[PDB]
């Protein structure tokens, strides 16, 4: 009765650094490549109201100051069945199918993080030491990106880059949405192949 383990990225950084933008954009890149929307979870999640099998789920400020969420998140990313709590009985009993889970913590178990990354602000866009949001938001003239319709220093790597703690590698918003898509495509390719033989 079961499914493929969602691909997961945690972005880690001290506040003010643009973590929630990083996830908003990444999530919706991915969501758009699959012709879907983003389901965006409030902090201290209790109920999943709004969840109608969106392709990506984003968790903001995961693990704030009693470990409910790490137990909620642990059944979001697995192959076991998970049917999340809902407030109104009208939509209760829907299965949690999201292919990706994007999330952010603060700065300073893991196995389900396909990628575990630090957010970093490059210095032209650093500000009195946290990001300059209006000046990094304004749009690049060129677009070299794999995943976007038009570009901006949040996407490029100009303002913010993502640094994976496990592999030491740098990414941008754009290349990591490409790396999250590749890895899932790997996973579905296998599973769909092996599911095929038992239907």
The footprint of its own copies (CB under 8 A) covers 2, 16, 20-21, 24-25, 28-29, 32, 37, 40, 42-47, 49-50, 52, 71, 74, 78-80, 87-88, 90-91, 109-112, 127-128, 130, 133-134, 137-139, 148-152, 154-155, 166, 183, 186-187, 189-190, 193-194, 196-199
Identify the bridge partners of residue 10 per DSSP, sorted by sequence position. Answer: 103, 116
Segment lying near ligand AGS (by CB under 6 A), choices 1-9, 69-77, 86-94, 159-167: 1-9
Strands 130-131 and 126-127: antiparallel
Identify the bridge partners of residue 11 per DSSP, sorted by sequence position. Answer: 104, 117
Q: How far apart are CA 26 and CA 90, in angstroms?
A: 31
SS3 108: coil
Q: Which does 9 bind (CB under 5 to 8 A by kind): its own copies, Zn ion, ligand AGS, none?
A: none
Nearest CA to 72 out of 93, 92, 42 is that of: 42
Which residue numbers in the chain precede an interruption (C–N > 2.5 Å)?
65, 108, 128
Distances in Å between the Cα of 154 and the Cα atoms of 4, 20, 63, 129, 130 are 30, 12, 25, 17, 14
What is the nearest approach in angstroms of ligand AGS to the Cβ of residue 64?
A: 8
What is the nearest approach in angstroms of ligand AGS to the Cβ of residue 89?
A: 27
What is the nearest approach in angstroms of ligand AGS to the Cβ of residue 149?
A: 18
Residue 131 binds to ligand AGS (criterion: CB under 6 A):
yes
**Which residues are at the interface with ligand AGS (CB under 6 A)?**
2, 4-5, 13, 15-21, 43, 60-61, 79, 104, 131, 133, 190-191
């Amino acid at each position: 009765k079961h499914r493929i383990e969602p691909v997961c990225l945690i972005i880690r950084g001290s506040p003010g650094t643009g973590k929630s933008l990083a996830t908003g954009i990444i999530a919706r890149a991915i969501a758009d490549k699959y012709h879907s929307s983003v389901y965006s979870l409030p902090p201290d999640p209790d109920h999943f109201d709004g969840y109608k099998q969106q392709v990506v789920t984003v968790m903001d400020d995961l693990c704030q100051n009693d470990g409910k969420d790490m137990s909620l998140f642990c059944q979001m990313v697995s192959t076991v069945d998970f049917i999340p709590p809902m407030a109104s009985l009208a939509e209760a009993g829907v299965s949690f199918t999201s292919k990706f889970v994007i999330a952010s913590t603060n700065a300073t178990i893991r196995r389900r993080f396909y990628m575990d990354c630090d957010i970093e602000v490059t210095d032209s866009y650093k500000t009195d030491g946290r990001l300059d949001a209006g000046r990094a938001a304004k749009l690049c003239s060129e677009n070299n990106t794999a995943n976007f319709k038009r570009c901006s220093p949040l996407v490029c790597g100009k303002a913010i880059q993502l640094r994976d703690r496990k592999s030491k590698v740098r990414y941008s918003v754009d290349t990591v949405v490409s790396e999250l898509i590749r890895e899932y495509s790997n996973r579905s390719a296998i599973g769909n192949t092996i599911e095929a033989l038992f239907q």
